[PDB]
Amino acid sequence: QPHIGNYRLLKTIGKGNFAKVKLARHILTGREVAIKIIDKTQLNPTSLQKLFREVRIMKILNHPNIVKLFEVIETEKTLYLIMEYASGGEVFDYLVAHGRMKEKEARSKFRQIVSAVQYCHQKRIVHRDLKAENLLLDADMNIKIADFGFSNEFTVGGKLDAFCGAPPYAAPELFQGKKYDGPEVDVWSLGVILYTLVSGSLPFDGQNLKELRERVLRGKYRIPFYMSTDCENLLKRFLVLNPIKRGTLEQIMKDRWINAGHEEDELKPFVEPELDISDQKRIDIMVGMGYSQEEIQESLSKMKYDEITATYLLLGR
Amino acid sequence: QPHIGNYRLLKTIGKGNFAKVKLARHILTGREVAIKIIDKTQLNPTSLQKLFREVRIMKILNHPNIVKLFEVIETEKTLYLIMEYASGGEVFDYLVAHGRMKEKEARSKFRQIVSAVQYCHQKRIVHRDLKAENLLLDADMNIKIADFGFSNEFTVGGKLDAFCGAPPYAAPELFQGKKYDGPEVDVWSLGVILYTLVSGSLPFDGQNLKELRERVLRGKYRIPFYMSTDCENLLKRFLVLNPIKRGTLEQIMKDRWINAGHEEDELKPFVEPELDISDQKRIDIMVGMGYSQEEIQESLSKMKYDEITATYLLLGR
Numbered sequence: 001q002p003h004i005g006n007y008r009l010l011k012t013i014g015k016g017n018f019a020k021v022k023l024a025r026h027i028l029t030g031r032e033v034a035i036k037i038i039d040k041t042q043l044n045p046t047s048l049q050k051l052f053r054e055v056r057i058m059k060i061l062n063h064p065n066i067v068k069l070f071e072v073i074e075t076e077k078t079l080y081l082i083m084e085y086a087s088g089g090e091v092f093d094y095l096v097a098h099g100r101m102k103e104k105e106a107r108s109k110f111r112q113i114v115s116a117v118q119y120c121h122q123k124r125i126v127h128r129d130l131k132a133e134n135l136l137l138d139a140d141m142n143i144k145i146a147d148f149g150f151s152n153e154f155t156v157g158g159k160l161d162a163f164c165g166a167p168p169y170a171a172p173e174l175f176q177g178k179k180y181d182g183p184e185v186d187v188w189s190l191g192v193i194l195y196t197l198v199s200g201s202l203p204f205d206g207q208n209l210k211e212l213r214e215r216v217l218r219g220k221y222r223i224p225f226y227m228s229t230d231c232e233n234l235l236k237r238f239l240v241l242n243p244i245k246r247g248t249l250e251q252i253m254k255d256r257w258i259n260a261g262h263e264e265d266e267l268k269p270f271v272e273p274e275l276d277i278s279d280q281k282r283i284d285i286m287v288g289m290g291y292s293q294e295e296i297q298e299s300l301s302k303m304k305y306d307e308i309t310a311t312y313l314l315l316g317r
Numbered sequence: 318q319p320h321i322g323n324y325r326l327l328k329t330i331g332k333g334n335f336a337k338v339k340l341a342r343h344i345l346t347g348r349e350v351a352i353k354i355i356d357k358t359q360l361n362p363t364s365l366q367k368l369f370r371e372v373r374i375m376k377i378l379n380h381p382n383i384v385k386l387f388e389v390i391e392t393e394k395t396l397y398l399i400m401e402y403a404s405g406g407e408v409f410d411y412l413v414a415h416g417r418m419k420e421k422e423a424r425s426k427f428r429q430i431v432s433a434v435q436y437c438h439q440k441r442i443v444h445r446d447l448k449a450e451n452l453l454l455d456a457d458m459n460i461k462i463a464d465f466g467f468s469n470e471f472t473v474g475g476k477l478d479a480f481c482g483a484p485p486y487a488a489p490e491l492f493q494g495k496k497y498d499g500p501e502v503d504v505w506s507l508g509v510i511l512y513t514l515v516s517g518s519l520p521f522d523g524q525n526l527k528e529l530r531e532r533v534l535r536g537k538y539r540i541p542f543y544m545s546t547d548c549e550n551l552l553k554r555f556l557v558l559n560p561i562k563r564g565t566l567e568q569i570m571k572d573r574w575i576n577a578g579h580e581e582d583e584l585k586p587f588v589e590p591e592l593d594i595s596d597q598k599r600i601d602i603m604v605g606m607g608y609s610q611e612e613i614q615e616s617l618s619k620m621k622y623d624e625i626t627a628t629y630l631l632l633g634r
Contacts, residue, residue, distance in 0.1 A: 129525040152524045162525040164481040170526060177493035177534070180527050207469045208446045209483050210497045217494065 004080055005073045006307055007035060014156030018042055021156055023085060028289055029314040033070060034085035038154055041077045047153060054150050055081065057125060059305060063270055065116040067136070067146045071310035082310060086144035088137030092196060100200035103228060107260065110194055111267055112143040114258070117190060118249040119270040121183040125149040128181060130189035131165035133157060167212050168192065168202045172241050175213050184243035187252075191238025198231055199224060203239070217241070230257040277301060282315045320344070321397060322390045323624055324352065331473030335359055338473055340402060345606055346631040350387060351402040355471065358394050364470060371467050372398065376622065379589055380436050382429040384453070384463045388627035399627060403461035405454030409513060417517035420545060421578070427511055428575060428584055429460040434507060435566040436587040438500045442466040445497060447506035448482035450474070484529050485509065485519045489558050492530050501560040504569075508555025515548055516541050520556070534558075547574035594618060599632045 002009060007024040013034070014021040020037045043051065058069040058081065071082035088094070091109070095101070101109070113135065120126070127134070127148050133155070136144040147155060152162050171188035173180055195203040203221035206212035219241045223232050234257045237247035252258065253267040277300035286296055291308055299308035319326045324341040330351070331338035337354045357365060375386040375398070388399035405411065408426070412418070418426070430452065437443070444451070444465050450472070453461045464472055469479050488505035490497055512520040520538035523529035532538075536558045540549050551574040554564035569575065570584040594617040603613055608625060616625035 128527050159522075159524055160481060163484045163529075164478055166526045167480045174526065174530060175492055175494050177495075180530065207479055209480055209487060209491060210445060212480065213491065213497070 004035070005071070005082075006311070007033065007082065009035070016156035017153075017158045019154050019156060024082070026082075026310070026314050028311050029317075031314045031317060032085050033314075034083045036081045036083060036154070038079040038081075039077065040079055050151055051079065051154060054154070055079075057149050059303075060123065061120065061125070061148070062272060063116050063119045065112040065143045065145055066119070066148065067144050068313075069305065070313050071307070072305045084144065086136035086138045086146065088139060088141060088144075090132045091135040091137060091143070091193075092132035094137060095196055095200050101197050103198065103231060103257075104261070106194070106197035107258070109141075109143050109197055111258065111262075113145070113190065113193060114249055114253060115267065115270050116143065116145045117148075117186055118253070120148055121186070121249060122269060126181065126183050126186055127189075128185045129162055129166055130169045130186060130193070131161060133161050133165065135193065167209065168204060170216065171243065172216050172219065173243055175217060182243070183248070184246050187238055187246050187249060188240075188243075190249075191235055194231075194235060194238065195221065198227055228257070230260070234258065275303075277312075279312075279316070282312055285315060286311060321352070322388070323628070324350065324399065326352070332475075333473035334470070334476045336471050336473065341399070343627070343631050345628055348631040348634060349402050349404075350631075351400045353398040353400060353471075355396040355398075356394060357396055367468060368396065368471060371471065372396075374442060374466055376620075377440065378437065378442070378465075380433050380587055382433040382460045382462055383436070383465065384461050385630075386622065387630055388624065389622045401455075401461065403453035403455045403463065405456060405458060407449050408452040408454055408460065408510075409449035411454060412513055412517050418514050420515060420548060423511070423514035423548075424574070424577065426458075426460050426514060428579075430462070430507060430510060431566060431570060431575070432584065432587050433460070433462045434465070434503055435570070437465055438503070438566065439586060443498065443500050443503055445502045446483055447486045447503060447510070450482060452510065484526065485521060487533065488560065489533050489536065490560050492534055495560070499560070500566075501563050504555055504563055504566065505557075505560075507566075508552055511548075511552060511555065512538065515544060545574070547577065551575065592617075592620075594629070596629075596633070599629055602632060603628060 006027050008027060010023045010025060012020060012022050018038060022035050022037065024033050024035045025031070026033060038051065040048065055072065062068065067086060068084040069081060070084065073080040073082070125148070129152070134146055134148060136146050138144050152159055155161060169189040169192045171180070171185045173185065192203060204212060204215040206215060219239060221239065234252070234255050237252050237255065240246045250269060259266050283293070283296055286308065287293060289311070296308055299306050300312060303309060323344050325344055327340040327342060329337060329339050335355055339352050339354060341350050341352050342348070343350060355368065360368065372389065379385065384403065385401045386398060387401070390397040390399070442465070446469070451463055451465060453463050455461050486506040486509045488497070488502040490502065509520060521529060521532040523532055536556065538556065551572050554569050554572065557563040567586060570586070575584050600610060600613055603625070604610060606628070613625055613629070616623050617629055620626060
């Protein structure tokens with residue numbers, strides 16, 4: 001237990017029903033990572049297949065504002081997912097500690113959040129369960145979205161995180177008896193998030209579910225005097241009771257407030273860079289570590305998420 | 318060492334936003350009690366009125382399976398509510414620790430739960446917010462319903478945890494956008510509770526709000542092989558999606574399973590007996606302690622909830 005694969009395991013930073021998360025250090029590059037450790041012997045067949053599908057989703061989410069998977073290590077009883085470590089905690093906890101962000105700083109965070117979520121939506125991944133645990137900060141105050149489209153069953157907080165933390169962010173369709181599944185649901189949640197960044201508090205709240213419900217269905221929220229008119233007008237594009245009338249993220253990216261100070265740099269859909277698996281400076285380093293040319297090209301081209309692809313990625317950070 | 322009125326204060330057992338709960342011992346009788354301590358100076362005028370309304374509610378609920386108020390002490394700054402202490406913890410935690418109850422045991426607790434809740438409803442007190450914390454066990458495994466009809470504002474809960482434990486017991490009308498204020502809501506929650514007593518498990522679960530909401534709206538739940546036909550039939554009378562068709566408590570009390578083994582003893586609405594405030598044996602002990610008959614007769618006959626009425630009640634326990 002002091003090591004797994006090419007990682008020295010350090011402090012346990014969370015423990016849940018079916019998973020633990022440890023901080024760790026990659027031995028070959030010296031980088032810090034977070035390792036999620038899932039006990040497979042405690043999962044039935046359905047839960048086991050959900051896990052693997054979700055691992056496949058983590059492999060295809062590659063965006064500077066979404067927690068990146070670096071490596072998978074699997075044994076008959078345990079699954080280890082070696083992940084990017086975001087050391088800055090939850091955005092909402094930051095807001096409770098430091099109060100509201102001025103509009104300039106809220107804008108630089110909200111541009112990152114809209115880009116990351118739109119990017120998921122474009123690949124047909126919708127979360128429908130946004131809560132404070134999903135929005136993290138790294139050491140440089142960049143947004144890192146965690147566990148997006150990744151079941152609570154495999155998290156440290158488990159179901160309780162959703163029941164305790166999801167209602168304030170739930171779209172009004174949750175209490176209207178019909179579907180709850182398209183991207184429009186996450187668009188409502190992102191309006192709630194914008195409101196928290198600019199005010200430091202929740203637009204809808206109550207002492208019990210019935211009261212929270214009332215406020216969410218009514219759709220009315222306080223606009224403080226310090227909030228610009230342009231921010232107020234953006235909130236109106238997210239917080240619409242009729243999901244059909246709600247704005248889409250690709251449209252909302254053209255909003256005046258969103259692009260203030262970005263006259264020459266308008267927000268638009270993220271486009272993945274072409275993945276460079278042929279950087280010779282890093283390949284030469286890996287050859288120096290004892291991998292062969294041929295092993296490196298095979299693990300990179302088949303994108304194996306093994307010792308090699310992780311070392312290549314971590315050498316690039 | 319520390320005391321308030323006739324009570325030696327022992328350990329702190331709950332720490333909430335506006336309220337603390339301490340175990341205490343009544344020094345004249347040696348009986349243990351739980352004291353809710355509310356600091357008035359942190360409340361504004363309206364919630365202060367709320368608190369007092371809620372004290373007036375505790376004063377008229379007198380049922381053997383509802384936490385009883387013994388005394389009120391009030392200073393300039395602080396309100397002390399001296400309450401019955403239920404030392405056996407929450408029923409859901411007992412089921413988690415010990416597994417399901419056999420039908421005969423489940424039936425004895427459920428008859429207590431149904432009698433207590435129908436009694437509240439008759440006095441027009443509806444909770445609509447049932448959670449595991451509401452159902453406690455005393456040292457003899459009798460049910461003690463706590464905080465029923467009272468705001469989460471004054472419970473230990475803890476501020477931001479108000480939504481944690483409600484969704485699994487919530488009636489489907491919450492998610493359909495329908496009125497959520499009548500006794501029918503608590504009837505659905507008592508079906509959830511029956512199911513937990515006999516199976517050890519919740520009937521509707523999910524890993525997030527969306528999945529839980531979808532099980533609740535669909536209304537279907539697993540019947541384990543060991544559950545009797547009569548228990549399954551009783552469940553069908555509570556877990557009815559349509560709140561008008563849903564059975565009422567007065568009708569349900571007549572059910573075959575509720576009454577098995579109670580031939581000469583059909584469950585029916587609680588009738589509070591006349592309080593015997595004329596027990597000369599207790600009156601004599603109290604005169605010995607320093608009280609006078611005359612003043613004893615005054616506090617009891619006017620039910621003042623002062624040190625006399627508490628001592629008289631505690632002596633009968």
